[PDB]
Design a protein around this ligand. Structure first.
Ligand SMILES: CCC1=C(C)/C(=C/C2=NC(=C\c3[nH]c(/C=C4\NC(=O)[C@H](C)[C@H]4CC)c(C)c3CCC(=O)O)/C(CCC(=O)O)=C2C)NC1=O
Ligand SMILES: CCC1=C(C)/C(=C/C2=NC(=C\c3[nH]c(/C=C4\NC(=O)[C@H](C)[C@H]4CC)c(C)c3CCC(=O)O)/C(CCC(=O)O)=C2C)NC1=O
Ligand SMILES: CCC1=C(C)/C(=C/C2=NC(=C\c3[nH]c(/C=C4\NC(=O)[C@H](C)[C@H]4CC)c(C)c3CCC(=O)O)/C(CCC(=O)O)=C2C)NC1=O
Ligand SMILES: CCC1=C(C)/C(=C/C2=NC(=C\c3[nH]c(/C=C4\NC(=O)[C@H](C)[C@H]4CC)c(C)c3CCC(=O)O)/C(CCC(=O)O)=C2C)NC1=O
Ligand SMILES: CCC1=C(C)/C(=C/C2=NC(=C\c3[nH]c(/C=C4\NC(=O)[C@H](C)[C@H]4CC)c(C)c3CCC(=O)O)/C(CCC(=O)O)=C2C)NC1=O
Ligand SMILES: CCC1=C(C)/C(=C/C2=NC(=C\c3[nH]c(/C=C4\NC(=O)[C@H](C)[C@H]4CC)c(C)c3CCC(=O)O)/C(CCC(=O)O)=C2C)NC1=O
Ligand SMILES: CCC1=C(C)/C(=C/C2=NC(=C\c3[nH]c(/C=C4\NC(=O)[C@H](C)[C@H]4CC)c(C)c3CCC(=O)O)/C(CCC(=O)O)=C2C)NC1=O
Ligand SMILES: CCC1=C(C)/C(=C/C2=NC(=C\c3[nH]c(/C=C4\NC(=O)[C@H](C)[C@H]4CC)c(C)c3CCC(=O)O)/C(CCC(=O)O)=C2C)NC1=O
Ligand SMILES: CCC1=C(C)/C(=C/C2=NC(=C\c3[nH]c(/C=C4\NC(=O)[C@H](C)[C@H]4CC)c(C)c3CCC(=O)O)/C(CCC(=O)O)=C2C)NC1=O
Ligand SMILES: CCC1=C(C)/C(=C/C2=NC(=C\c3[nH]c(/C=C4\NC(=O)[C@H](C)[C@H]4CC)c(C)c3CCC(=O)O)/C(CCC(=O)O)=C2C)NC1=O
Ligand SMILES: CCC1=C(C)/C(=C/C2=NC(=C\c3[nH]c(/C=C4\NC(=O)[C@H](C)[C@H]4CC)c(C)c3CCC(=O)O)/C(CCC(=O)O)=C2C)NC1=O
Lengths: 172, 197, 162, 172, 162, 163, 172, 162, 172
C-alpha cells in the first residue's frame, strides 16, 4: 500500500524532481515523532478488546431497537459479525495511525463497504455512531500515560480524530 | 469544645482549631483563608459559635472545597457530615435539600442546616459540632451509622477537593436503593415487554 | 435454516440426484416423531414463565456472590436482561423441538456465542446451571420420548455452552 | 472549575514556563470574539424556558410511557424533577459556553449523574434524548438575529453542539 | 482558579440561577480589558531575564548584609534559587494579567506564602524589594492602560507579601 | 412514604425513640372508626368514573369556552381526551386520600411540585378549580352524612392547594 | 413508610387502576379488626421491659459466653447496648404491628443491620436468638386475656410471629 | 439595594479584605455603562405617558375575555389601577437602569412576587405581555447599546413574572 | 488510645484477671524511667521547628524533583502541606514517646494516611524518606547532654527510632 513516505515519493515522481529540503524536514519530523506514534498504537492494541466491548455497550444502550428481535444483530450470529466489524475497523485505523497515512484505510477498509451494508440491510448511520463511540472510548486510553513518559501528542490526537472522522463520513 | 462567653485568650485558638478541623474536614486551611473579622466578632461574643460556623459555611473556601468540584449529592452528604456530624438517612433529605438549594440559593440551603432544630438540640449556640453518628442517635436508620462509617474512612484522611477521584459521591448509591427499589419487581416486566417488543 | 429435512434436501441438491430409501426413511422418522416433540414444545410454552423466573432464582441460589452491588450481576435492567436472555434460550430450545433438528440453536445461538461472551465476559456456566434447572423441571413436567428428546436437545445446548 | 484561560495557565505551570506566544495569540482571539459568546449565552439565558418546554413536549411525545402510570415521570413530583434536571443541564451548558470550557459541566454536574440515574432506576436514554431536544431547541433559539448585529457564529454553534453532546454522552 | 468569568460563574452557580444582565456586563468589561492585559503580558514575557536579574541585584543591594557568608545570600545555588523565586513571581504576575484576575497568584504563591516564608526563615522584605524593582522597571517599560493594569497586580502581590 | 394518621404517629414515635403512648392510640382508634364512611365514599366515587370525569370536562368547557376554540390548549381531540385523563387522575387521588384517611396520597402524588408542572406546560389552575367545584356539586348529591363531609373536606383541600 | 392502606394504594396506582371492590373489602376488614390490632400493640408497648428482661435472662442463660470477660456484652457499656438494641427491635416490631406491614421494620430498622453488627464484631446469631426469645416472651404477654374483651385473634399472633421472624432472619 | 457597586462592596467585605483588582475594575466597567444607561433612562422617561396607555391597551386587546364584564379587566377603577401599576413598573425600570443593576427593580417587584400576584388572583401573563409590548416600543425608541440595556432589563422583569 | 499502663490493663481484662505482680513490676519500672521519658519528649518538643526545617532541607536537597514544576511540593500551598504533614508526624511520635506505646500512631496519625497519599498522589517513599530524616535530626537533639543530668537512655532512643520506623512503614 501507499504510506506517507510512499505518497511523498509518488508525488515526487509525478513532478519528476528530487526531494526538497523541506520534504526531508517533514519526513524527519515524522520519524522523530514515530516514538510517540508507537506509544499511541500500543495504547490502541492493549485496550482494543476492552475498547470494542464498552463501545458496544454504549452503542446498544444508545440503540435498543436492534438487539431485540427483527434487528440485524438479533440472531446473535450478527453479534459475531458486528463485533468482528468493530475489531477490524479499529485494526485498520490503527494501521493508518501507525503508517500516518490514511491511504491504507481507504483501500483495505472502505473502498466499497457502503454498498456492502446497504445490500446487507445494515443501517450505516448506526455504524457511524459506532465508530464515533469507538473514538470516544479510545481517546481515554490514548491520554493514559500509565507506565509511559508524559508528553504532548496533540498532533497525533488530532490525526486520530480526523482518522475516525474519515471513517464516519465514509461509512455514513 | 464549648466556649463560655467570659472565656479567656487561651482555647479560643483551641476552639478555632477544632472548628477548622471539623467544618472543613482534615483539609488544611492556610491562614490566608481564616476570616479574621469573623474570629474577632466571635471573640467578644458578638456572634456565637453557631453564627461563626454559619459564616465559615458561607465563605468561599468552604464552597471551593465542597460545592464547585462536586455534584449536589456529594455536597448534601458533606453538609450533613460536617455541619451536623451524621450521614443523611434517606433520599427525602437529599431531595429536600437539593430543591431548597435550587430554589433559594446556597444561603438558604446552609441556613436549613445551621438553624435547624437538630443543630439546636445536639450542639446549640455554643458547642462545636462533632461526629455523632457512630453512636446510636435517636430515630436513625442503620444506614446513618453505615454512612458515617463510609464517609469517615480514617482519622488521617479527609474530604479533599484536590484528589484524583474528583471528590465523587461515596454514599448516594448506598442511600439511593432502599426507598426506591420496591417498584423494581414491576419495572422488571415493564422492561421485559419493552425489550421483547 | 438447518433441520433434517433441510440437510437432506441440500445433500440431494448439491450432490445432484433424486432421493432414495435412506433420506425418505429419515423423513418418515421425522414426520412421525413430530407429535411427541411438538406437544413437548407446547408444554414448554405452557410452563415457560415459571421456568425463566425460577431459573433466575436458581442462578442466584448458585451464584449469590455475583449479585451484590458493585459487580456485574447487580442492576435492575441487568436483571430484566438476565430473564430476557434465558427466555431466548428456552425459546430456541422450543424451536429446536419443533424443527426436530438442532438447527435453530446452531444458526442463532451456537453461531458465534463464544466470542460475544468473551467480549462481554459472560460466563457460560451461568446459562449452564440455568439449563440444569430447566432439565430438573422438565423431568417432571414432561414424560416419555418427549422428555427424552427435549433433554437431548438441551444437553446439546449445554455442550455448545460447555 | 476552569475556563480556557485557566486551562492554558494550568498547562503553562505543568511545563513551568511562561505562556508562549501562540497561546497568548489564541487567547487574545478568544477574548476578541468573546462578544459573540456573551450574546449567545444571553440568548440561551433568556430563551431557556422555551427550550425546556419544547424539550418536554417532544420528549413526552416520543415516549409517553414516561407519563403512563408507573412510568418514571408519572406523578407531579417526578415531572418537577424531570423539568428541574433539564433546566440544570441547560444551566451548565450555558456556563460552559461562557467559560469556553467543559470542566464545570463535567465536574460539577456530570461526574455522578449517570450513577444517580442508575441508582434510581431512571432510564438514562430518556435523559439523553431530553438533552438532545434541548440542543435542538437551543440552536433554533440561537439563530435568532433580532435586536442584534448580524455576523458569523459557527464557532459558537459548534461549541454549544459539542457541550450538549458532551452532556448527552456522559449521561449515556 | 478565580477569574472574572470564573467568579461570575461561581456566584451564578452557588445561588442556583442563570447569569443575569450584571454578570454579563462584568464579563463584557473583562473582554474589553483583555487586550491591554495581553499586551502587558507580552511585554513582561519578553523582558523576563532583565527584570529577574535587576531585581536580584536590587535585593542584594538593599540589604547588603545578606550577601556575606553565614547567611541566606551566600552560596551560588542560593542565588540561583533567588533568581528562580523572582522568576516565579514574575511568571505568576503575567498569569494574573492574562487571566485578568488575581486567581493564579492566590492559588500558587499567596496560599501558603506566610507559612513557607516562616518555615525556611525567608523574609518578605526581600520579595517586596524585588517586586518594587519590577514595579519601577515596568513603569518605564509599559505605558497607558497596560501600565496601570500590570502595576495593580504588582502592588497586589506586594500587599500580600507585606 | 405516604403520610396517613398511622404513618405520622409511627414517625413521631420513631423520631423520639419511644413506644406508641396513649395519644397516638387515641388518633389511631378514632381514625380506624372513621375509616368506614371514608371507604363508603371512596367506593361510591369509584363507581362513578364516567359521570364525574365527563361532567367535569363539560363544566370546564362551559366555564372556559375560549379554550375550546382553535389556537388554544383545548383544541385537538386527543387533547381533551387526556384532559379527561387528568380529571380521572384527580378523582382517583381523591378516592385514594379517602381510603387512606389522610392527605398522603393526594400530596405525594399531585400536590408535590404541582405549581412547577402547571407553569412549565402552562396549565391554568382555575381550570382544575372549576372542575373540582363541579365535583363538589356531584358529591353534594351522590353522598350523604359523614361520607359527604370527608369527601368535601378532601376536595376543598385539593382546591386550596390548586387555588 | 407503608402501612397496609398506603401499600394497597401503591399497588393500585402503579398498575394505573382504582381500588377494586375486593381490595376495599380486605382493607375495611383490616379497619374493623383495627381495634384488636390496637390491643395487641398496647400489649407490646406496656409489657416491653418485661419482654426485654425475660429475653435477656434466657439469652445470657444459654450463652454465658457473652457476659464473660472478652465476650461481646461484657464491659457493662456493651450490656446497655444489648438492652437498647432489644428495645429498638421490639419498638420497630410494634410499629410494624400497628401499621400492618413490615415496611417500617424493613426500612427504618433492618436494611443495614447485619453489616453494622459485622462491622462492630457483634455476633449476629446471638441477636437473632435474642429476637426469637423476645418473640416467645412477647406472645405470652400478647395472649393475656385479662382486663380486655375476649375474642379470636390468631391472625395477630401469626402476624407478630412473622414480624419477629423477619427481624431475626434479617439480622441472622 | 443591589448595584454592581453593592456586590463589589459586599464580596469585598464578606472575605474581610481590601478591594483588590477585580471588584474595582468591575466598578470601572459599571462606570462606562452608567451614562449611556442614563440617556436611555431619559428616553424611557420622556415617553411614559404614551407607554402606560400602550401597555394598558395591549392588555385589553391581547386578552379579550379579561375586558368583558365581571372579570379582572372590566371596571374603570380596575383600569386606573392597571395604568398606575404599569407606571410603577416603568418607573422601577428607570430606577434599575440608572442604577446599572436590577436592584431597585428586584426589591420592588421580584423578591417573592408570585404570592402577591396569587393573593389577589392577578395573573402574571397580563404583565408579561404588557412588558413585551414595552419591549417592542423601546426597541424603536432606542437602538444599539441603549436598546440592549433596556431590553435586558425588561427581559429580566418578564422572567421574574414568568 | 492506650498508653502502656492501659495496654497492660486491657490484656489483663482479656484474661479476666488482676494484673500480675510481674506486670506491676514492669509498669513500676516504666514509671521510674518516666523522668528520662519526659526529658526525651521535651527535647523533641522544644526542637520541633529545628527538626522539621532540617529534615525539609535534607529532603529537598537529596530529592529536588518535588519542587520543580509537576513535582509534589510545588506551590506555596503544597509546601505548607508538606511541612504541616511532617510537623504532625513529629508531634505524634512525641505523643507516642510520652505514652510509651504506639497506640496513638495507628489510632490517629496513620489511621487513614497511606490511603490519603495514594489518593492525592503524593509519593509515599518520599514521605518515608522525610520521616527517616526526622529520625536522624531528632536523635541528635535527644542525645543533647546539655542542661540535663547524665544517664543511659539508649532504650528511649531505640523506642523513638522504632516509632519513626513504624510511621515510615505505615506510610510507605
Ligand atoms: C515496541 C515499540 C516501542 C515503543 C512502544 C516505545 C515506547 C517509548 N517511548 C519513549 C519516550 C516517549 N514516549 C512518548 C509518548 C507517550 N507519552 C505521551 O504523553 C503520550 C500519552 C504517549 C503517546 C500517545 C513521549 C512523549 C516520549 C518522550 C520522548 C520525547 O521527548 O519526544 C521511549 C523512551 C524512554 C522509555 O523507555 O520509556 C520508549 C521506549 N519504544 C519502542 O521502540
Ligand atoms: C437470542 C440470542 C442472544 C444472546 C446469546 C444474547 C447475549 C447478550 N447478552 C447481552 C447483555 C448481558 N447478558 C448478561 C448475562 C445475564 N445477565 C447476568 O446477570 C446473568 C449471569 C446472566 C443471566 C443468568 C450480561 C452480564 C450482560 C451485560 C449487560 C450490560 O453490561 O449492559 C446482550 C446485549 C448487550 C446489552 O444491551 O446489555 C446480548 C446480545 N442475546 C441474545 O438475544
Ligand atoms: C399524577 C398527577 C398528574 C396529572 C393530573 C398530570 C396532568 C398533566 N398535564 C399535562 C400538560 C397538559 N394538561 C392539559 C389539560 C388542559 N387541557 C384543557 O383542555 C383543560 C382546561 C385542561 C384539563 C381539563 C393539556 C392540554 C396539557 C398539554 C400542554 C402542552 O403539552 O403544552 C401533562 C403532560 C402530558 C402531555 O404532554 O401530553 C400531564 C401528565 N400530571 C401528573 O403527574
Ligand atoms: C445540581 C446538579 C445535579 C442535578 C440537577 C442532579 C439531578 C437529580 N435527579 C434526581 C432524581 C430524578 N431525575 C429525574 C429526571 C429523569 N427522570 C426521567 O426519566 C426524566 C425523563 C428524566 C429527565 C430528563 C426524575 C424524574 C427524578 C425523580 C426520581 C425519583 O424521585 O425517584 C436526583 C436524586 C434525587 C432528586 O433530586 O430528586 C438528582 C440528584 N444531580 C446533580 O448532581
Ligand atoms: C449587557 C450584556 C451584553 C449583551 C446583551 C451583549 C450583546 C452585544 N453583542 C455585541 C457585538 C456582536 N454580537 C454579535 C452576535 C449576534 N449577531 C449574530 O447574528 C448572532 C446570531 C448573534 C448572537 C450569537 C455580533 C455579530 C456582533 C458584532 C461583531 C463583533 O462584535 O465583532 C455588542 C457590541 C456592539 C458593537 O461592537 O458595536 C453587544 C452589546 N453584549 C453584552 O456584554
Ligand atoms: C510559587 C513558587 C514557589 C516559591 C515562590 C517558593 C519559595 C521558596 N524559596 C525557597 C528557597 C530560598 N529562597 C531564597 C531567596 C533569598 N536569597 C537571598 O537571600 C535574597 C535576599 C533572597 C532573594 C530575593 C533563599 C535564601 C532560599 C533558601 C532558604 C533555605 O534553604 O534556608 C524555598 C525552599 C526550597 C525551594 O523550593 O527551592 C521555597 C519553598 N517555593 C515555590 O514552590
Ligand atoms: C434504628 C435501628 C438500629 C439498630 C437496631 C441499631 C443497632 C446497633 N447496635 C450497636 C452497638 C451494640 N449492640 C450490641 C448487642 C449485641 N451484643 C450481644 O451479642 C447481644 C446478643 C446483642 C444484642 C441483641 C452490643 C454489645 C453493642 C456494642 C458494640 C461495641 O460498642 O463495640 C450499634 C453501634 C452504635 C453504638 O455503639 O451504640 C448499632 C448501630 N442501630 C440502629 O440505627
Ligand atoms: C386507646 C387505645 C384503645 C384500646 C387498647 C382499645 C381496646 C378495645 N377493645 C375492644 C374489643 C376487643 N378487644 C379485643 C382484644 C383482646 N381480645 C383477645 O382475646 C386478646 C386477649 C386480645 C387481643 C389479642 C378483641 C378480640 C375485641 C373484640 C372486637 C371485635 O368484635 O372485633 C374495644 C371495643 C369495646 C370495649 O371493650 O370497650 C375496645 C375499645 N380501644 C382503644 O381506643
Ligand atoms: C409599588 C409597586 C406596585 C405594584 C407592582 C403593584 C401591583 C398591584 N396591583 C394590585 C391590584 C390590581 N391590579 C389590577 C390590574 C390587573 N387586573 C386586570 O385589570 C389587568 C388585566 C391587569 C393589569 C395588567 C387590578 C384589576 C387590581 C384590583 C384587584 C383585583 O381586581 O383582583 C395590587 C394589590 C393592592 C393594590 O394596589 O390595590 C398590587 C400590589 N402595586 C404597587 O403599589
Ligand atoms: C491525623 C493528622 C493529619 C495527617 C497525618 C494528615 C496528612 C495530609 N496531608 C495532606 C495534603 C499534602 N501533604 C503533602 C506532603 C508531601 N509533600 C511531599 O511530598 C512530602 C514528601 C510529603 C510530606 C512528608 C502534600 C504535597 C499535600 C498536598 C497534595 C495535594 O493536595 O495534591 C492531606 C489532605 C488535606 C488537604 O486537602 O490539604 C492530608 C489529610 N492530615 C492530617 O489532618
Ligand atoms: C518541666 C518538667 C520537668 C521534666 C520533663 C523533668 C525531667 C527530669 N529530669 C531529671 C534528671 C534526668 N534526666 C535524664 C535524661 C537525660 N539523660 C541523658 O542521658 C539524656 C541526654 C537525657 C534523656 C534523653 C536522666 C537520666 C536523669 C536522671 C534521673 C534518673 O536517673 O532517674 C529529673 C530528676 C532530677 C535528678 O535526678 O537530677 C526530672 C524530674 N523535670 C521537670 O521539672
Amino acid at each position: 500500500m501507499n504510506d506517507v513516505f510512499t505518497r511523498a515519493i509518488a508525488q515526487a515522481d509525478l513532478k519528476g524532481s528530487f526531494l526538497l529540503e523541506s520534504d526531508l524536514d517533514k519526513l524527519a519530523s515524522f520519524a522523530k515523532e514515530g516514538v510517540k506514534r508507537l506509544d499511541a498504537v500500543a495504547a490502541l492494541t492493549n485496550n482494543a478488546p476492552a475498547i470494542i466491548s464498552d463501545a458496544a455497550h454504549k452503542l446498544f444502550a444508545e440503540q435498543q431497537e436492534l438487539i431485540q428481535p427483527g434487528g440485524n444483530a438479533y440472531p446473535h450470529r450478527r453479534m459475531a459479525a458486528c463485533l468482528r466489524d468493530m475489531e477490524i475497523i479499529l485494526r485498520y485505523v490503527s494501521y493508518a495511525l501507525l503508517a500516518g497515512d490514511a491511504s491504507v484505510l481507504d483501500d483495505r477498509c472502505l473502498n466499497g463497504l457502503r454498498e456492502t451494508y446497504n445490500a446487507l440491510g445494515t443501517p450505516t448511520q448506526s455504524v457511524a455512531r459506532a465508530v464515533q463511540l469507538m473514538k470516544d472510548a479510545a481517546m481515554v486510553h490514548l491520554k493514559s500515560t500509565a507506565n509511559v513518559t508524559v508528553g504532548d501528542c496533540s498532533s497525533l490526537y488530532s490525526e486520530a480524530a480526523t482518522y475516525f472522522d474519515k471513517a464516519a463520513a465514509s461509512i455514513a | 469544645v464549648t466556649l463560655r462567653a467570659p472565656f479567656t485568650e487561651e482555647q479560643f485558638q483551641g476552639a478555632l482549631y477544632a472548628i477548622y478541623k471539623q467544618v472543613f474536614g482534615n483539609t488544611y486551611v492556610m491562614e490566608s483563608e481564616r476570616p479574621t473579622t469573623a474570629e474577632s466578632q466571635l471573640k467578644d461574643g458578638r456572634i456565637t459559635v453557631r453564627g461563626f460556623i454559619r459564616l465559615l459555611a458561607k465563605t468561599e473556601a468552604y464552597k471551593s472545597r465542597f460545592l464547585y468540584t462536586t455534584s449536589q449529592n456529594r455536597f448534601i452528604e458533606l453538609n450533613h457530615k460536617l455541619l451536623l456530624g451524621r450521614a443523611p438517612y434517606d433520599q427525602a433529605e437529599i431531595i429536600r435539600h437539593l430543591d431548597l438549594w435550587n430554589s433559594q440559593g446556597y444561603d438558604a440551603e446552609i441556613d436549613s442546616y445551621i438553624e435547624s432544630e437538630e443543630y439546636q438540640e445536639f450542639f446549640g449556640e455554643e458547642v462545636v459540632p462533632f461526629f455523632r453518628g457512630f453512636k446510636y442517635q435517636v430515630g436513625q436508620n442503620p444506614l446513618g451509622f453505615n454512612g458515617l462509617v463510609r464517609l469517615y474512612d480514617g482519622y488521617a484522611g479527609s474530604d479533599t477537593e484536590r484528589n484524583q477521584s474528583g471528590q465523587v459521591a461515596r454514599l448516594t448509591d448506598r442511600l439511593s436503593r432502599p426507598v426506591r427499589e420496591q417498584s423494581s419487581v414491576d419495572r422488571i416486566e415493564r422492561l421485559l415487554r419493552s425489550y421483547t417488543s | 435454516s438447518r433441520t433434517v429435512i433441510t440437510e437432506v434436501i441440500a445433500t440431494a441438491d448439491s450432490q445432484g440426484r433424486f432421493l432414495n430409501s435412506t433420506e425418505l426413511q429419515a423423513a418418515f422418522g421425522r414426520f412421525e416423531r413430530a407429535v411427541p416433540a411438538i406437544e413437548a414444545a407446547r408444554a414448554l410454552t405452557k410452563n415457560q414463565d415459571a421456568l425463566v423466573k425460577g431459573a433466575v432464582q436458581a442462578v442466584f441460589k448458585k451464584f449469590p456472590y455475583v449479585t451484590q452491588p458493585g459487580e456485574k450481576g447487580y442492576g435492575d435492567s441487568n436483571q430484566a436482561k438476565c430473564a430476557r436472555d434465558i427466555g431466548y434460550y428456552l425459546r430456541f430450545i422450543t424451536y429446536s423441538l419443533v424443527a426436530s433438528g438442532t438447527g435453530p440453536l446452531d444458526d442463532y445461538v451456537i453461531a458465534g456465542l463464544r466470542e460475544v461472551n468473551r467480549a462481554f465476559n459472560l460466563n457460560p456456566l451461568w446459562y449452564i446451571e440455568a439449563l440444569n434447572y430447566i432439565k430438573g423441571e422438565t423431568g417432571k413436567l414432561l414424560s416419555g420420548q418427549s422428555k427424552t428428546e427435549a433433554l437431548l436437545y438441551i444437553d446439546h445446548a449445554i455442550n455448545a455452552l460447555s
